[PDB]
């Protein structure tokens, strides 16, 4: 049993907020309940709604006049809605069910709400030298630069390096972009000859990009 | 986020800790609590249900007990893995679900001192008119640490961003990294560019520098 929020994106004041649940491995009528759960950047876990086996529904109270969850039989799937959005409203939501004891959660997806616009990163090689060598261990990383909204996901070379891997919280510049770093320690020894390739992919602007990461002549 | 818990709680690799989830009448007392671990980049995961059970897939390192308006979750044998934030979970009077605002678990471990790595801006980046240069601080602990960028020894205030990992799941660690940016007119106006890096774990400040052109 799986479920799958639809991937993460950016709101603009006062529109409404759609998400999607598809549900995997398990009929959605069969389940006790289908339900949402959001969670604001550095908070706690807040309840929204959820959707009983009869098809009743019950939100929170203080979201109730904003908020719809409805399933779709036919593609197996609930959804939810939230019109009238704010600032106030960008969070990690996660969806969530009980089948048959805990409940089967989503992977979550963050929703961003500003009245700022969809911008793809550029990626930057962290290159590797002697100023990032310390004995037989060598330094070297992406700079993924100037995107919004969060989030970015990053990788190293198709998954298959994963030791050693530090990616690094964004951090909100001054011109209301992103920027993060991703680094990982390899063998210096392992420079001239292993390809090191940092995956990066940005889902609300659909960008995707593979950067090999050469080392620096010093 | 109704319920009160501790914003964090520590402990060894093999100690134990508690974290205490403080309700009140209509949620905690009257109903089950239960307990979830939401590792970074996670959904939260169930340890325990209605007040003491645990689910298949949980080892009996975690408990969980209740008394009157407050529940407590029990985690011994502490594992590295265990870094995580822990949230307490129960229902209101009217049933609907509530949580706890959540507790950070940091694994206290020996000092460590910092690697430090820097980085000069790419020729790409410098083609677009920008200059961002990143310094490296790798596997320390504990988690402060001082990060000073100076460019010809003027010593930049205000000029830099930085951002710390969550504890690394292997060794217990933290990471930092500091970007400088400047424009690629004031990046050439300047010659020696440096990070300066003071820990717990060094007897002395750390320093590293380039000079621009040399790569």
């Known amino acids: 049993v799986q479920l799958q929020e639809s991937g993460p994106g950016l709101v603009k004041p006062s529109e409404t907020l759609s998400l999607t649940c598809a549900v995997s491995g398990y009929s959605i009528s069969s389940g006790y309940y289908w339900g949402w759960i959001r969670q604001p950047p550095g908070k706690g876990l807040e309840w929204i709604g959820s959707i009983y086996h009869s098809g009743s529904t019950y939100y929170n109270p203080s979201l109730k006049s904003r908020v719809t969850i409805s399933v779709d039989t036919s593609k197996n799937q609930f959804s939810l809605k939230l019109s009238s959005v704010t600032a106030a409203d960008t969070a990690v939501y996660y969806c969530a069910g009980l089948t048959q004891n805990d409940a089967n959660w989503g992977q979550g997806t963050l929703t961003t709400v500003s009245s700022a616009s969809t911008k793809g990163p550029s990626v930057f090689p962290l290159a590797p030298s002697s100023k990032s060598t310390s004995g037989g261990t060598a330094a070297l990383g992406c700079l993924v630069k100037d995107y919004f909204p969060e989030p970015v996901t990053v990788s190293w070379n198709s998954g298959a390096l994963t030791s050693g891997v530090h990616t690094f919280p964004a951090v909100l510049q001054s011109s209301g972009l992103y920027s993060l770093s991703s680094v990982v320690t390899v063998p210096s020894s392992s420079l001239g000859t292993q390809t090191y390739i940092c995956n990066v992919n940005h889902k609300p602007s659909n960008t995707k990009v593979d950067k090999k990461v050469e080392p620096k002549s010093c | 986020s109704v319920l009160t818990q501790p914003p964090s709680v520590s402990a060894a690799p093999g100690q134990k800790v508690t974290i205490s989830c403080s309700g009140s009448?209509?949620?905690?007392?009257?109903?089950?609590v239960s307990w979830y671990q939401q590792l970074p980049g996670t959904a939260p995961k169930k340890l325990i249900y209605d007040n003491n059970k645990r689910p298949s897939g949980i080892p009996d390192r975690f408990s969980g007990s209740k008394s009157g308006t407050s529940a407590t979750l029990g985690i011994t044998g502490l594992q590295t893995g265990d870094e995580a934030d822990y949230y307490c979970?129960?229902?209101?009077?009217?049933?609907?679900?509530?949580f706890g605002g959540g507790t950070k678990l940091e694994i206290k471990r020996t000092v460590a001192a910092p690697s430090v790595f820097i980085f000069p801006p790419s020729d790409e980046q410098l083609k677009s008119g920008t200059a961002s240069v990143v310094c490296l601080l790798n596997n320390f602990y504990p988690r402060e640490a001082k990060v000073q960028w100076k460019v010809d020894n003027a010593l930049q205030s205000g000029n830099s961003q930085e951002s710390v990992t969550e504890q690394d799941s292997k060794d217990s660690t933290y990471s930092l990294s500091s970007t400088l940016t400047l424009s690629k007119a004031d990046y050439e106006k300047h010659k020696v560019y440096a990070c300066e890096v003071t820990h717990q774990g060094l007897s002395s400040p750390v320093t590293k520098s380039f000079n621009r052109g040399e790569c």
């Open positions: 009448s209509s949620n905690i007392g009257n109903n089950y």
């Open positions: 979970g129960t229902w209101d009077s009217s049933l609907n679900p509530v």
